[PDB]
């Protein structure tokens, strides 16, 4: 008797919340693709961040039906935020950017989630 979610249904409901993150310019730019530690010259990245996540990966998961239920989408969006908050200094542009995406997500996700209950 747990609620069931069809992937097309989940995509219709959640994709505008992902679009809200992506549209944030410039704050979304560092998050639109996986961190590349070799490019950035930060070989300790994957030692610190065990489970990388980014907006393109979440999008591909939505597009291909990999979330059974909406809380799994929330988990990935927060994995991305937490990884950035963990790795980067609080004063850093990227950390502040991350916080902006979180503030946006907070506004967008609450009414969407209630509509899925």
Ligand X SMILES: CCOc1cc(C(=O)O)cc(-c2c(C)noc2C)c1
67 contributes a contact to ligand X by CB under 6 A: no
Farthest CA pair distance, the chain: 50
Q: Which is nearer to ligand X, 26 or 117 (CB)?
A: 26
31 contributes a contact to ligand X by CB under 6 A: yes
Q: Which is nearer to ligand X, 4 or 86 (CB)?
A: 86
How far apart CA 70 and CA 89 sit, in angstroms, is 30
Say if CB 35 and CB 45 are below 8 A apart: yes
94 contributes a contact to ligand X by CB under 6 A: yes
Say if CB 34 and CB 52 are below 8 A apart: yes
100 contributes a contact to ligand X by CB under 6 A: no
Query: In the set 10, 18, 77, 101, which binds ligand X (CB under 6 A)?
Result: 18
Select from 19, 3, 39 the least CA-distant residue to 108.
Answer: 19
Q: Which residues bind ligand X (CB under 6 A)?
A: 15-16, 18-19, 22, 30-31, 35, 40, 42, 59, 84, 87-88, 94
């Amino acid at each position: 008797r747990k609620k069931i979610f069809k992937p097309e249904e989940l995509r219709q409901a959640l994709m505008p919340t992902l679009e809200a993150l992506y549209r944030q310019d410039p704050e979304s730019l560092p998050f639109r693709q996986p961190v590349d530690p070799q490019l950035l010259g930060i070989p300790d990245y994957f030692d610190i961040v065990k489970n990388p996540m980014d907006l393109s990966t979440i999008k591909r998961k939505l597009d291909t039906g990999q979330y059974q239920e909406p809380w799994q989408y929330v988990d990935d969006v927060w994995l991305m935020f937490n990884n950035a908050w963990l790795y980067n200094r609080k004063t850093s542009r990227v950390y502040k950017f991350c916080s902006k995406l979180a503030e946006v997500f907070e506004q967008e996700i609450d009414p969407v989630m209630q509509s899925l209950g």
